[PDB]
């Protein structure tokens, strides 16, 4: 069918975005020269991606063998967490670079400590409110149906919320970046190259189908946001961990040291 055509597509996306991000997480941790306050934002993003790929391999197995167990009710809470926490570490990372360009001077630098409270803390707030709302209003099976749209907007709310905000922060960076290009200090070629770098890191491909009803076009919404959208963790790794002049130098220098 079509569903097993997507389910067998992102399990390859979530898999190649798991052997690549772990390899990316190792390089970021092993080499100590690559220990910045921005590589800690990336490390928290890389873990949120791996938490998303892991929680889906468990979710599909529990929901589909491939009975309404309480272990369902505890794996959906872990599934709606390791996914909402990924739409927030894409937003936090866009908010971090936006606070590196805007508010350049007197950087409080406690923002990074407040970012962990938002990346890993706000999902716990929005999931628990969703979880404790299912046991009181609509408790149907493993609650994988999400028929109650009022209770579904408790999860889709913060998720879509961190996509309209992570978009205006993407434009604000593009506006600021082009001013660095407009100044006299191939302009379309590198601005386009830079835009193709900020798209996987900020999750701008989620802006295409966000704020769109689920029913209007769903067969293409899932092959785009899940089929090739699950390869975002793999693209984010090879673009930002690998293929990076600062990171590539470390393997090079530690190669001649060997």
């Amino acid at each position: 069918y079509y569903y097993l055509s997507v389910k067998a597509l992102y399990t390859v996306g979530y898999s190649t975005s798991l052997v690549t991000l772990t390899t990316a997480m190792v390089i970021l941790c092993r080499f100590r020269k690559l220990h910045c306050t921005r590589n800690f934002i990336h490390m928290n993003l890389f873990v949120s991606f791996m938490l998303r790929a892991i929680s889906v391999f468990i979710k599909d197995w529990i929901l589909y063998a491939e009975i309404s167990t309480v272990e369902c009710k505890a794996v959906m809470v872990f599934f709606h967490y390791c996914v909402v926490s990924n739409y927030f570490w894409l937003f936090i990372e866009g908010l971090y670079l936006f606070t590196l360009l805007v508010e350049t001077f007197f950087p409080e630098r406690r923002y990074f400590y407040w970012y962990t409270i938002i990346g890993w803390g706000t999902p716990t707030v929005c999931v628990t409110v969703w979880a404790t709302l299912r046991l009181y209003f609509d408790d149907t099976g493993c609650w994988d149906m999400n028929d109650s749209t009022a209770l579904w907007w408790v999860i889709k709310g913060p998720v879509v919320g961190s996509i309209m905000v992570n978009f205006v922060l993407f434009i604000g960076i593009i506006v600021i970046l082009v001013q660095k290009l407009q100044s006299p200090d191939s302009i379309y070629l590198r601005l386009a190259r830079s835009t193709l770098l900020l798209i996987p890191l900020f999750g701008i491909h989620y802006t295409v189908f966000a704020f769109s009803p689920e029913n209007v076009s769903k067969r293409e919404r899932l092959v785009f946001e899940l089929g090739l959208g699950s390869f975002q963790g793999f693209v984010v790794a090879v673009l930002y961990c690998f293929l990076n002049g600062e990171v590539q130098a470390e393997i090079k220098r530690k190669w001649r040291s060997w």
Partner: peptide, 27 residues
């Protein structure tokens, strides 16, 4: 989100193949 829509659609699909098959045998 994007995964909460596939599980909504695929779980409702498997449930539809279970009710529409059980109702097909008895009818």
């Amino acid at each position: 989100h994007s995964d909460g829509i596939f599980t909504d659609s695929y779980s409702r699909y498997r449930k539809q193949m279970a009710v529409k098959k059980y109702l097909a045998a008895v009818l």
